Amino acid sequence: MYLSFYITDTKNKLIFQYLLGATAPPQLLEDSSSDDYLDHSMVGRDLEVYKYFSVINKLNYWCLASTSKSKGPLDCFTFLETIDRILLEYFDKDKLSIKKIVNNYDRISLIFNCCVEAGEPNVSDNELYVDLLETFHVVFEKKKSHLRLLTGSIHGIVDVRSYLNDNPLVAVKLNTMGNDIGIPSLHDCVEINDGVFSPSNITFIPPDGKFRLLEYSVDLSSQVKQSGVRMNSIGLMSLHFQNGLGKDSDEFELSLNIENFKKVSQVDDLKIDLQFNVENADPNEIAYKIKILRNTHGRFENSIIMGQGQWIFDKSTATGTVPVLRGCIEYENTGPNFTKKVDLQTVSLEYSYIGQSASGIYVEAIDIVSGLTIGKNTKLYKGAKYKTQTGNFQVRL
């Protein structure tokens, strides 16, 4: 029987293929520009060749499997995932972009083989630092002046980089700042045993390797309602677009307060992409002008042509300080075909923080367990680093 694996990019180009064994020889692909899209193909003949396909997209790479006849689709998906991970660990870690794949296309094949050798798919499975990175994304709905967090997804990854000498155990205590923190997802080198470990606690065994310790996804809608959090800072970014417009102008005020971020650790790069629908209105209809937006700590550059704002806040602005981004949108029209409407559409704000907790998983203490005592020689490191990403905040007006 033959198995084959292929890896394609987002633009449908095959990046890697592998065949194992043997004799071996448009709508979804068309769509894959969407990132999510390829689904199965049957090459098929009765040589059943079956095909199957599965595709996996990770970190811009797509992975296609084929199987010949039997194995089942799910079995092929599981093999695809393990392969993905292995590709991350091997290549160290940070990216497998198409460019990286290509360069490393063989390194991927080699892995595939190993996974299959062991027979089995092998299955698929002193200083400490904890670097909590958090990427929020939140879908807000404006109604009446207040932005109500309708949805949101904060994705936390918690990595930890260690430097022990042996393999002691770690307990991590996460705090809830009464937001029941509910599901921390834990990395294959991590254990969360049952309520022994409490819901707020996590135990992890060394790898040497950077390890994502826990990913946490918190759906802000219930949390925020349970915790009452109008995000007063972060996430709830309140944009006020004032119509009372004239035929060309408009003013919108967006404030991103960082009151609730004091312990959220630095924000490495808040990027705001405001889309002014110009897709359905023809950029000539939307000539828009963004006149002033003032951040106290970042930089704005406008792309009118393209019909977009990007505002990039640099990491220095940290506490309590509230970067306020005001400014004005003026819709300049050389056509008459602009009716002074710009449906104002969705302003997605993606934040990335470092060193803080996606759910509020701030690790309040990290303790070591092995018959060890405190100052038996264990120290605290610096420079784990996690990353977290979802998709993306959205404020609808």
């Binding site: 098929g44 003949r45 009765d46 040589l47 059943e48």
Partner: protein
């Protein structure tokens, strides 16, 4: 130093070829063109001719210089004159053209054939720009066109040809002279050209075509070449010269093609084969003369030849020819086929094993042809019907490899027709069909074949005793099938059961009952198809069956009648 000049010139030429200011280089090139050495003059001239385009002052200068060189005796005078003229021709402006014409006119009158040739070629390029100049020089050409030297004549002609491309009206004037020259030339290339020219004039002016045609065919008859022969043919076929008045011409051309096709060179072959086909589409009689040639080409390995043959075979078939062709194709394809189905190797002779060779599109075409052949007349004459039946089944097999579904469809349709016709063969056909169905390869890819088979069996179940095995096949295969097929199968089976029930009385036999039951279970399963239409179609049949069963249980004799009684009742109830 002359050697340095040559170097400078090389560099300037390279710069002018790039797309660089030629005006700046002109002055320099002009000075070099004034060097006595003939080589330097030649290189200078080449550069200027590359440069002149657009700048009129430069051009003017270049002209003056070339003129001087033309007038100088020159003693390698031929070369210098020769080059200069080319040069001037490649320069075009109205001012220059005016000057040049006078110079060319003088040079046309030089003795030396080299000079004359060049001069002619020049007047060509000039005219390509400036029509007035042409008019004035038109006369000279006519005089030169009449020089004794075949190379000079050949040139005069080419020139008149170009001018027809740009001016046809003036040259429709000279056409007679051209016809008189072509009649005086011994040289093949010269003849070939003259032929083209007339073709060019024909697109414009059928009158000419008529005069010239017969001059072509006489010339082809006197030249051997080969190109003159092909040419006459292409001209004949092109001007669309042909028109029918020109059949006779075409015939001669064909006869010459056939002789050539019958040379071992693929270039000449292909060219002939194509020309033959084209003619055939147009003239069947010619084809009948060229069947032999075709058959021989079938054994040629060249895909363009093969494809061209198959296309010819389709319009030639006679019965003996049919059978021959069929067998030949079947054999070839078992031995010619594969290559591009597999890859796409380029052709080789050598492997002693041979990579083997047909494209995918050739295969599909072949099959289509076979089917047509069998259905024409009607090949009531495959004498051996057996062969046809075989062939058809075979094709189906190979195509399973191809798919293209359409191949597979056409084949099926044909098979059905054969079966309907030739009641003998039916039994053979049915047996094969049943086997093909139970061999999974048909199920793969082939819903159409399955649909056809289903039909054939309902009709001929009356021939087949064991209508039980057939039906247990079909019932087992229904789960493997597409919706269209499922609909068909359902429909057929029902059509059958009606026939059987009419015959069962042997006992009613229990078997019929079991078979009905099975069919029922199946149809129930299909009543669960996602497409509502199909679903309803199946549910209807399920009920129909269940009925027959009940009837059989209670009776035997009353079954056929009962079915016509109950079945419609059910059907109406459901629909109602």
């Amino acid at each position: 130093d002359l050697n340095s000049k040559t170097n400078a010139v090389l560099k300037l030429t390279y710069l002018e070829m790039y797309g660089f200011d030629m005006a700046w280089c002109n002055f320099h090139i002009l000075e070099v063109m004034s060097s006595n050495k003939l080589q330097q003059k030649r290189v200078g001239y080449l550069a200027a001719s590359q440069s002149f385009y657009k700048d009129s002052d430069i051009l003017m200068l270049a002209t003056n210089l070339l003129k001087k060189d033309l007038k100088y005796d020159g003693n390698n005078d031929v070369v210098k004159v020769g080059i200069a003229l080319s040069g001037l021709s490649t320069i075009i402006t109205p001012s220059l053209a005016r000057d040049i014409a006078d110079d060319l006119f003088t040079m046309l009158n030089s003795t030396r054939p080299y000079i004359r040739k060049k001069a002619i070629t020049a007047l060509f390029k000039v005219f390509l720009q400036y029509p007035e100049a042409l008019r004035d020089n038109f006369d000279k050409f006519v005089s030169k066109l009449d020089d004794d030297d075949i190379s000079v004549v050949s040139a005069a002609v080419s020139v008149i040809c170009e001018l027809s491309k740009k001016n046809p009206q003036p040259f429709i004037q000279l056409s007679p002279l051209l016809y008189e020259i072509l009649v005086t030339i011994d040289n093949n290339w010269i003849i070939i050209r003259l032929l083209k020219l007339f073709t060019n004039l024909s697109q414009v002016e059928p009158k000419l075509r008529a005069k010239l045609l017969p001059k072509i065919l006489e010339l082809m008859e006197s030249t051997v070449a080969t190109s003159v022969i092909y040419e006459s043919v292409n001209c004949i076929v092109k001007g669309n010269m042909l028109e029918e008045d020109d059949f006779e011409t075409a015939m001669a051309c064909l006869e010459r093609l056939h002789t050539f096709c019958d040379s071992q060179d693929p270039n000449l072959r292909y060219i002939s084969c194509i020309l033959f086909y084209k003619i055939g589409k147009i003239n069947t009689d010619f084809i009948s003369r060229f069947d032999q040639l075709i058959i021989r080409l079938l054994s040629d390995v060249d895909v363009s030849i093969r494809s061209k043959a198959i296309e010819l075979v389709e319009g030639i078939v006679d019965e003996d020819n049919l059978k021959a062709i069929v067998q030949t194709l079947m054999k070839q394809f078992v031995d010619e086929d594969v290559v591009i189905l597999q890859t796409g190797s380029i052709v080789y002779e050598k492997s002693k094993r041979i990579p083997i060779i047909i494209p995918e599109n050739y295969k599909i075409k072949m099959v289509n042809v076979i089917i047509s052949i069998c259905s024409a007349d009607n090949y009531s004459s495959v004498n051996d019907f057996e062969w046809y039946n075989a062939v058809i089944m075979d094709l189906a097999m190979l195509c399973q490899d191809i798919s293209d579904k359409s191949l597979g469809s056409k084949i099926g349709e044909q098979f059905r027709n054969l079966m309907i016709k030739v009641p003998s063969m039916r039994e053979v056909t049915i047996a094969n069909i049943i086997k093909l169905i139970s061999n999974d390869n048909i199920n793969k890819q082939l819903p159409t074949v399955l649909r056809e088979c289903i039909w054939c069996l309902g009709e001929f179940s009356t021939l087949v005793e064991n209508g039980n095995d057939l039906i247990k096949i079909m019932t087992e295969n229904i789960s493997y099938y597409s919706h269209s097929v499922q609909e068909v199968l359902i429909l057929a089976l029902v059509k059958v059961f009606s026939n059987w029930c009419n015959n069962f009385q042997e006992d009613k036999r229990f078997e019929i009952k079991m078979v009905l039951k099975e069919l029922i279970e199946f149809f129930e399963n299909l009543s669960y198809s996602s497409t509502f239409e199909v679903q309803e179609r199946s549910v209807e049949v399920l009920e129909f069956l269940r009925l027959s069963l009940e009837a059989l249980e209670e009776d035997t004799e009353g079954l056929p009648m009962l079915l016509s009684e109950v079945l419609p009742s059910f059907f109406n109830a459901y629909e109602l």
